[PDB]
Structure formats: structure tokens, C-alpha cells
Write a protein that binds this DNA or RNA. Structure first.
Lengths: 149, 117
RNA sequence: CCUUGUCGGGUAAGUUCCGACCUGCACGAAUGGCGUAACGAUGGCGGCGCUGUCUCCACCCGAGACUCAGUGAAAUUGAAAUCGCUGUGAAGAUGCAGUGUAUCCGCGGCUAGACGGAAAGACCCCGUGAACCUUUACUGUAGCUUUGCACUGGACUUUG
RNA sequence: AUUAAAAACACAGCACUCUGCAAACACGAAAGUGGACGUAUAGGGUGUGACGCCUGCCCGGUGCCGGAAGGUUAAUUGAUG
RNA sequence: GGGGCAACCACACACCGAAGCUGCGGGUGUCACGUAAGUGACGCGGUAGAGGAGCGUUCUGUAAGCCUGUGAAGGUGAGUUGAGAAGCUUGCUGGAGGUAUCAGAAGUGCGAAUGCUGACAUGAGUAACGACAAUGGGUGUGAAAAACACCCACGCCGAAAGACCAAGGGUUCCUGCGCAACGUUAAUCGACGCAGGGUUAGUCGGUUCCUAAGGCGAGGCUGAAAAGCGUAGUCGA
RNA sequence: AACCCACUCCCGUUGAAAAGGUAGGGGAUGACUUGUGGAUCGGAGUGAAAGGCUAAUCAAGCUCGGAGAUAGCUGGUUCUC
RNA sequence: GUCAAGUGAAGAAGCGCAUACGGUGGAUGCCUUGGCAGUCAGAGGCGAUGAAAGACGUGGUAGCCUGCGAAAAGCUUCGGGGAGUCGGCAAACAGACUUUGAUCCGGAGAUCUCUGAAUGGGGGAACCCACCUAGGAUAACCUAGGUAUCUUGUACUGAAUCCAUAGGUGCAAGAGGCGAACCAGGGGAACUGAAACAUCUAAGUACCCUGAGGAAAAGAAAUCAACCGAGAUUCCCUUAGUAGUGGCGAGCGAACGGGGAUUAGCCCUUAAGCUAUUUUAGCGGAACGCUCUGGAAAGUGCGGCCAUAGUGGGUGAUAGCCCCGUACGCGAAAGGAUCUUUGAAGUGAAAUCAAGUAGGACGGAGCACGAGAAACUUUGUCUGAACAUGGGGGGACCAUCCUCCAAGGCUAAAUACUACUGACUGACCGAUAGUGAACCAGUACCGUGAGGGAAAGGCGAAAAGAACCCCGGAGAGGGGAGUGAAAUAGACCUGAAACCGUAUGCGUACAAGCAGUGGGAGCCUACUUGUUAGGUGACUGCGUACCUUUUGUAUAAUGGGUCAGCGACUUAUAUUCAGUGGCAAGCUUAACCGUAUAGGGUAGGCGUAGCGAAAGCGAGUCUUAAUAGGGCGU
């Protein structure tokens, strides 16, 4: 705001040469390389995204962090019903990977502390390396052959 | 992420003003003078590690020279006397025997005279 | 210009002044030429009266300067434990080399030095710098002016 | 105005020249206003500067005024090839 | 260079003298070795500049983890460890937040720009205290009188240093209560703080009536648009 | 003499004062001085002409935009090995 | 018990160094009522029924903010709820209603002083002087309305002039002003680039006027393509930085063709016209107990429960279960808006057509296109056709083919913007940052004005904000005492550096200089008592600060009074080379769709083959009479 006249004449005053009150050397004058908003986005590839997804899905098997089940189906949208069903497999803090994400299963675990439910195309390369144990079904192991081959 | 540099500037100032204590007046308390007197007092401490070796060698020589005239030689004919023979003794431990162990020094000097140099 | 040209006057002595000579480097007639009474806070010389202007200063009266109580600035400043002399040295030394002198700390005076303080030197040069002025520099333009076509007609005539 | 009060600028007086009124001239995109509710004994411009005695020769250069005979010379026409 | 006599020529040995060389102890680049460092095997003053390898700060992930009222971040000492940037453990102050590890994202590190904004110094308890119209006693009040009030006596203006209208200012006028700040000193005093009070018009100045220069101007002409000029008119002492 | 102006000397220059003061000077019935109110403005006014004045600024004001004008030129550029 | 000679410890006016406490000062740390930029929705205007902006006035006392307007922190009604209340910077008086209409929130109305387009005439904005009409009122007034100019219309009226126009009155309807950006037109610079500068760039950009809308403009072929065809406009991605244009300089730069978003076309202002949901207020809203330390438990322990609501806020320290909230439904007396029926009228479904017109000649503009072989659109001056058996286009020009009906109109959607709202979100700020402004900020102040424009946060969990005593001027300030977890938390969290002091130790009054470094006597205080360590440093050898400019600076060359805060190689889009990765004679998509970081989308680009100015020919091709040589390529 403001700052458009020379305060004190070029030569003859005794103070150093200044031309604007609103300058980076001065008091509240202005940042000299100011940042306006801008995007942050790499572009990896289509093929390169899949080879990373196919490589974390190998060491997930070699470290026994992967539990394949026949079918995972809750019945009523109630959170204390799903807590008991994860007690059968012996698991807590689970990423649940399935393709039939149902409104019984999605309304549950929106309040569980460490349990997250996703689709097989919503699975990103962070959550497969976080969420210490992953729980896939026998439908989701098929669809990785349609996606990744 | 604005970083404000007011806390890691201070640690580097106190590290200078610790090495520069004991100095006169304004060289030990304000920083734009105490930085010059820390660099300058490091150059002198580099030169004087070499000059330490020259100020004792010139002190050992002038003590052998005084002690060996009282027996009947110079310094320079004594060193040729010991190296006609093979005695192989530093200046540091001759100038100990000149002051403290005076009777062992005289038993050295007579052997340089027997070496006849 | 050469030049304090040469000649006379005024002073004990006159590069200025007054009067003439004319050999005008480079006077000259409405960018006027030569005279001229009265007027100039106008330029230059000479004289009477008068005087601390001066030989050469002496003394007295007030307001500051000096001491005591109250209040209390400013420019300046890399840091100081801040002497002289003869050398050296980016070429004129409180600080280097040699050698003489000096017990520690104030107050009143004086200005030789600290290339003393104030001002990015104005003189001088540069910058394919800036301004504003000039003309017969170049390219244009306001304005003024010539001739076509409009607004714009008939009646006779000379003449292609 | 705040380092220059003059020998500078003014001036009464003198001459030259342009202007016949809807004037020359100036300010205005233009309407219009000054000139001037004046009318060549007036109004603009340029130089010299009361008074006295006077103001010499040169029309090649440049400018203005006068003259048209002849030369070149603009758009406009458009024969001919 | 000085004291002083360490002078010149030929000549001989001896000593002295650098960060040079050698000895001993560490470190590192290079190339090989003996596996390119299991280990060898040969080099290192440096500006402009080119190449290699690291520390720290703030925010995000890992972080509903881990540490902390038995005491966090900070501030302040002391010890100790690395070639270095720096790290680590503790004494006191402090009173609620902090971030192993490894990766990202950078407003990412100041002594200097006659740099910018607050604080404090030297000059220095130094110059000055605003016309060379002079004050001297007394009595009073008060915590305290050169400066306040009254008294007595001296001085100074008197075509102003006196009275009054116009501007302009805006409660400075008057009385109780006060004296931290202000006033170039002190103040009990004040044009200074807090609380009250205080301006009376037919005739004096305004408004109302009329106009000068000048302004605005219906209709009207002129102008790309804004707008310009101007008749009736109505404002302007 | 009031009044308007600024010729000389000294003092002042961190002044009492961003142009005064104390002594002396020039005009003082007019080409005078002055109070109130109006008119003329930025390549534009005014000017007895000095490039003078137009709000302590003038060989073309002041302010906000073009605009973070352009600078082969000065100054500065921050932790280790 | 004597002289002479030699030797020299004390003693500090004041200073130096180290430590220990203080004072000044306000940094660092932690914290926020304030900002900042986005995402997704709204709604895009207010005003002659008197606006945006203000002056003055209003409270039981007194200034200022916030509300209101002589009916003045309010009045009347409907609706919601529900026990305290009298706005904020802040005390003692006085009182109103309880269980409902008191505060308090939303809808509708009534009042609405004077200024301001300001509009009855004037003015120095918040002032003065008035009329007219109908009523009321006492030599003095009060109610209630009216009274501006311009447009259009509409009556009445009637000059020179016989008629009848100008002109003049009366009425009706409309407009005027303000607002950040957006859009279309009118007018339109310069600096700067070109290492100077006149063409050209900058640039039809800044600015200045005039219109209108919630968007505008533009639009339904006298259009483009080549003998194949495509059928309105607007916007994004490619063609392509390519053809062109250019003192052929700096530079400026298309189209054809592809891919997407969106999916309507109709015709006469003028032959003869039509132009059913959401929204402003609310309400319900689940689940915890003992035990330690502490001033105070949410923390240590030990168990249980909730869940379509577990990373919210705040409660005396770290809370899913203490408090307010968080996922779904109900709505709503009454208004508003949006889709509908609907009413009129405009929104407007809804008929031709085209004369000073096309073309032409000088002079200019716009086309990417700077008279250039210059087509085409424009219009300032001057001219001028055929009648859809005609016409005009296909980049000088001409014949042949193709393709469209000019001189009259109307149109949604994709699109641009934010002064104003509301939710939300942050690898955004954390009082020298973030708005100029967290604080009574466009204020104080500086200006004749336009205009410029600051500095200013924090006691505690809670005022429990210090009764009482002693010194003092009856004060200021202290010393106690009390509150508190803590007053060195006392009107204020922490509390650093420069600067100034007061104590304690050791050294300095015959000694010359960047004030340090190497050796080193002595003294001191501690520890086992001395290398156990720390503090002073007599004496003595070597020693002319730091930065910048430069062939060189101790330089008498530059700069710096010291401290604490801030203060300088960044971003975006294109492209080249290296490092490390994916697929590989092939690699990869941009817009845009999408349950949206996935998937689709291969248009386009780079490559797999060159030589030539070009046609062209191809592992070869160009030059040439070349098959010879030679250039480039495999």
C-alpha cells in the first residue's frame, strides 16, 4: 500500500540513496521474491505407476503382511459387529482391500480408530506400505491380473 | 515456512565471545571487534609453534657455551670434540647437565679434550 | 597587442588622472556620430577641514568568558596502553627500523598536525547519458497560400 | 523575494512599415470575445532614446515589393504502343 | 642499523643458520596391491573459477507413536566428544509443551550495502538558559520563598510596553480543589490538570431590500464524448 | 516624521531569526503605498526583461498513474571440509 | 651496644581482568479476538415510495464506540423458546416477569428531524426566505398536501399573417445518482527494445469518456473446401512458432485439417406484424469408575462401555464417555427466490423482400499482411448498376467448373468477473510477520489543497487488585503484614545483548606503539592438598586491524558509533546436455470425461532413411554432356 515518491532527494542530504518507502531493505516494505500460488504435480507414467504397484505387492507377500480370505461380509451397519469379526482373524489396524464396498461395510469403520476400507482402484502406493497388515479377498486377487497383469 | 534466525545466530555469537575473554576493554565484549581479535590470536598461535622451537634451541646453546668456557673450551670446539668421537647427545640434555649435574658435565668435557678437537 | 608609446601639468618621487600627438593590430555616423546646463546611495583622480585610520597603543565603563548552586544540547566516533628525530614505504608515519628523551592525573590559553568536521567535486575527462536553446543539420508538421471536384444557376458573347 | 541596484530595463521625443472596418493582429477544434461601442491627427509591429549641430557612399549576397514575355512545374485527363 | 674498532687481500678448518631434508607420531587424494583400501602400493601452497562430500534451522510424512508437571520450550553456567560445520550429559531460572530415526518441502544460515526500525553510549555534567526598561527590604502563607500575595521605596514605556473596532482563534475568561507531567531553574503561582459557573438587543453589527467587478445560467447557438460561450433571469460588498 | 524600500560597516552563521538586529541611508501628492473581493496556469501563464516569479520547490511546478522506466556504471552478496 | 656501604616489603588519587549479585532495556520462547489465498455454493445490484455517504440528537448520572430518529439502545403484530434482564470501553442507584411473548433470535408493518441526484428559489452541505390549496387558530399562527428541468404523449391555447405552424399553459408516464471487477463502442500516449535512431516495436497497452447486462457481444451461409465434401456462433487442446509478413532488421505471426465442451433455430419494431421446490429460527442427539502424585487430574494405575457421530472446540495440566457440539429428520404464522399452470403484456414461438445499394476513382483504416503481382471487408470526398433467364465468391488477371442469395429483423447453452455473502480447507502468517490497521486506523500527525500516512498485543485457575501498622508534604516511594501453587506473578508470562553500577580477589605512580601470542616469577581460593584445577600476569622474544577496489595499501584511498531484530540467484512456460529409472523398432498422450491422485482419451509429437533450391528419385542421390570424378548418406 503506497510508496511512490522519493523521500529525500538524490544528493545533498547525508542519508543513503533511497527511492521508495516500500522496499525489501526497509521496514514493512515487501518480500523480494514473493510466492504466488502454483501447482505441485509429477506425471510419472502409466506403465511406471504399475511397476511400482507390482513391486510393493511382491515384498508384501515375502514379509507375510498379506492375509487373503474367502469373503469379508458384514451384515448390519453397526461398528461393534465389525470389531468382533476382525477378532476372528486376529487383526487390528487393517487396510481392507475389496471390490464390493457396500454400504453395510462403508458405514462401519468410519469411526474405527485404525481400520480403513477401500476399493481396489482406490488403493494407492502409500496405504499399501502404511497400514501394517493388508486384508484382501479372493475377488481382489483376480482383478490385479486385469489391472497389472 | 518462514524461518526466523534469532536463536541460531545467538549460539554462534556466544561461541566467539567465550574464546575472546580476558581481553582489554572493547575487544572482549562487543562482537564486531572481538571477531578480529580471535582470528589474529589464532595466526599468532600458529606462527609461535615454530618459533617456540627456535627460542629454546638458542637457549640451550648459550648455556653450553657458558658452562664449557669455565672448563677450558668454546662451544664450537666442543661440538667438534664430541663428533670426532661418537657421543650423540642432544642440546636439551647437555643444558640440563650444565646446571644440575655439573660433575658429569666435566667428565664429558675432558673426553672432548682427549678427542683433541 | 607591442606599452609604464612619446610630450607637457600636478607630487620630494605618479604603471592611475588631466591636456595634446596620431604611427586607428581592432573608432565611425539612427546595433546612431560628436557636444551638453541640471540631476545620480554611479566609475576614476586632486585639495581644505578633520580625526586612535596610523607611528604605538595606554586607561576607564557595561554585557559575556572564569568560580558556586539548578537544568542540561550538538556535529563527530574501526579500536586504543594516542612522544621527538633520521631513514624506509602506493612515493609527506603517534603505531615499521635504528636511536634519543618522559613519574601518574587535571584546569585556563593558543591553533602547528591528526592529508581536522560538513557536502558520493562544480574545474577536467568519460557515458553509442538528460535537459533546454540556435540555425542554412535531417525528417516532418501548425498556420498561410495556388489550383481541381462538391455546395452551384441562365442570358448573350469571343475562342479551341 | 534570500551574495549583483548598475553604465542594465523604462521613458518623453524620432523614423520606418503594415491596417478602409465583418480591419491588420491575438486567444480560441468551433461559436464567439479583445481590439473598440474606437474609424488612418486612429490602431498593431520593429529599431533609436530629452536638447543642440548632423546622419556619407554600396542594390552584388539574403529578404520584401513590382512585372509578365519566355522557360521548367502538382494532382486531374489517358491519345498511342 | 647503533656502541665501538672487530677494515682489505690470499687461505684453512670448525660452528651457527628456514615452515628446506631426516627422525618419530597422526590424516587424507591417487593408483595398484595382497581381493581396486583385507592391505598395500606414491602425493597435498593457492585468487578467478570447475569438480566431490557434509552440518544445522523451520514445516510435512513415519505421529492417536515416543518423551514431560518427579517438570517441556527457552535463558544461563560447567564438563566432555569429533578434521570442521556441530553434537552430548548435567547445576540453577523457567512453568507447558517437545520430536529417535529416515525421507520430502524450502521466505534455509549476515559484520560491512554513507542498509532499515527500536535501545543505549562518546562528545559532556561541557556550551547555552532568548535583547544590557535595574531592583532592595518587610509581612504573610507553606513540608519547603530570589520568582507567590500585600506593604513601603526605587526604576521603565506614555503617537505605546495604554485603550478600542475588523479579521483570525475557539473557552485560553471567573471561582473552589490540586503541583506527577509543562514552564528552558524552584514553585504554595499559572494561558497547566479535575469540578462548577459565565455571554440577555425594534435602534450596535448580521440576516431581510438594491447593486460593482465577477460567477452560474433556462431556452439558444457550438462541439468526437466530456463540454465551451451566452440572452431572460438570480446570486455576489 | 508615520509609511513603503534595502546603499554601507560591524555583530550573528549549532543564529533570538531556513535572510534579522543596532547605527547610519533613498522616496515621501504620486509612473504613489495599501485593506477587502475577484480574473489569468504547466511547453501554460504573467513579466519597466533578471530566465525573474507561479505556496520556504522553477532553462518549464506539485501529486497520483504508465512503472519493480533504463543504467556496458558504483556499493553489497550470509554455514564447513 | 656505635657509623659506613649494599639491598628494597608494605602504601592506589584512581584505573585493568575474572567472578558474584543487581538496574536499564525489550529480544528469544510459547500463545492468539486478526489477516492471507483457495475449493464448493449462493446473488449479481441500490435510488424520486428519496439511495451510497454523513451532520446533529437520543441512556437515571459522564466522554467515546454500537444501535436508532422528536413515536429516538425503541412501538405494534404474527412465529421460534424459556428464567433471568437493563448494548460495548466500566460502579453504585432505581425497578420490570416466572414458569411464559420479559430480555433474546427470524418475518411483516408504523414513525423516519436537517444535509446529500436533492428536485419550491437561493446558498459557504448539515443554513436562510417562501408561496398555493383545503381546512383550523385572538392584531403573532398551525395542520394537511402540493410547487425542479428534460423527454415522450395529451388536452386547451394561438405570433408577425388570411388561414396555421412556431410559441405558451394544463395533465399522464418515464429518466437523472451511486457501486470493486467483468463486456461492447468513442478518443488514444510515452519511456523502453532495435546495444545510436527517424520506418517498426512498446501497443490499440496505460489512462480518459459513453452505454448496457447479470453476463455481454457474436450467430442460422451472397460461408469453407476441390471435383471429394463439410453446414450457425462462442470456448479449451493441437496443427505451428510452420506458410507468410518484416530498415527481410528487432520482431510480429495465420489458416486448412483433426480432438473436445455445449445441442434449438427461426423470421418482419419495418411492403402487410406476433417484436412445483428451496430459503431466511430452531429442536432431539449415544457412552466412566475407583487409585496415586499435585494448588488443581483430562495424566500414573486398574477395569468397563458407546459408535451411521474417534484427531473438533474448553473445562484450574494431556478427556470418544464433564460441558457445548458432531450423523438424520421435522420444517415455517409469514415473506423471498427458483421450476411449474396463469393472468395480461413484453420472454415471443411467429411472412415476403431490399437503390443512391453492389461496383468504380483518389485518401485512410481493419485483415498475421510496413504498395507490395495485392484478393477481401470497411467508409471521409466524388460517382454509379443486372432484376434472383440475374447476381458474388474460389488471394493480381482471364476463360471453364464448383458453391452460395447481399442491401430487414429475432434468439437459450457451453463463457468472463467478485465490492458482497455463507460453509470449508491449508507442508499459509504468528505481532519489525500477516491487511496501511489483532490495540477506538485511514485515526494521530504533515500539507492552502489533490494527497501522504504512523506507532501502539500477554497479571492469575479466579480480582482473591494488597484490611491493618511504621517513615513521608496531609504525598510520591518504601518496610512489614495478609491473598495466592508462586508477588524477583503487584497492576505486571519468560526476561537476553550493548550501557551503567556495588562488593570480593590479583596486577599497576622511571615507563614508549593494532594491546595479542611463546616462555614465565609470584600471589590467591579451592581439591588430599602442589603438575591434583581455577583466577590474575611483574619480566621478556616475535608482532604496522578487517572489508572493497586494484599492477601495489599499515596506508594520509573507500566504508563502518556499538547492540538486538529483519536484509539479496526465485518462479512459470518452452528446450539442450549429464546422473539415475520405465517400457523398447517402438515410446508417450494434451484438453476433456470419470464413484475424481485410479481408469479412459493415441488427435498430435519424437523416432525407424537419405540426397536435392525444387519437381522428383530412393540405400543411394545431387552437379554434370556424365555412366568419369567429387559432396552428403548408409
Amino acid at each position: 500500500s503506497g510508496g511512490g515518491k522519493k523521500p529525500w532527494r538524490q544528493k545533498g542530504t547525508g542519508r543513503a540513496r533511497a527511492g521508495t518507502i516500500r522496499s525489501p531493505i526497509w521496514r514493512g516494505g515487501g518480500t523480494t521474491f514473493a510466492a504466488k500460488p502454483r501447482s505441485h504435480e509429477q506425471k510419472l507414467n502409466k506403465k511406471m505407476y504399475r511397476a511400482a504397484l507390482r513391486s510393493i505387492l511382491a515384498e508384501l507377500v515375502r514379509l507375510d503382511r498379506l492375509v487373503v480370505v474367502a469373503d469379508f461380509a458384514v451384515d448390519a451397519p453397526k461398528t461393534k459387529g465389525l470389531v468382533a469379526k476382525l477378532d476372528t482373524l486376529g487383526l487390528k489396524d487393517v487396510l481392507i482391500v475389496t471390490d464390493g464396498v457396500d454400504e453395510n461395510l462403508y458405514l462401519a469403520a468410519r469411526n474405527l480408530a485404525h481400520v480403513d476400507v477401500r476399493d481396489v482402484q482406490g488403493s494407492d502406493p502409500v496405504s499399501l506400505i502404511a497400514y501394517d497388515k493388508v486384508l484382501v479377498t479372493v475377488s481382489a486377487v483376480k482383478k490385479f491380473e486385469e489391472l497389472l497383469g | 515456512a518462514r524461518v526466523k534466525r534469532g536463536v541460531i545466530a545467538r549460539r554462534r555469537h556466544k561461541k566467539i565471545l567465550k574464546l575472546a575473554k580476558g581481553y582489554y576493554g572493547a575487544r572482549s565484549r562487543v562482537f564486531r571487534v572481538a571477531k578480529q581479535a580471535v582470528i589474529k590470536a589464532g595466526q599468532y598461535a600458529y606462527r609461535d609453534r615454530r618459533q617456540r622451537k627456535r627460542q629454546f634451541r638458542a637457549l640451550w646453546i648459550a648455556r653450553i657455551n657458558a658452562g664449557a668456557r669455565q672448563n677450558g673450551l668454546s662451544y664450537s670446539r666442543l661440538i667438534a670434540g664430541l663428533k670426532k668421537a661418537a657421543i650423540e647427545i642432544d642440546r636439551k640434555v647437555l643444558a640440563d647437565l650444565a646446571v644440575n649435574e655439573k660433575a658429569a658435565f666435566t667428565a664429558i668435557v675432558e673426553k672432548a679434550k682427549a678427542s683433541l678437537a
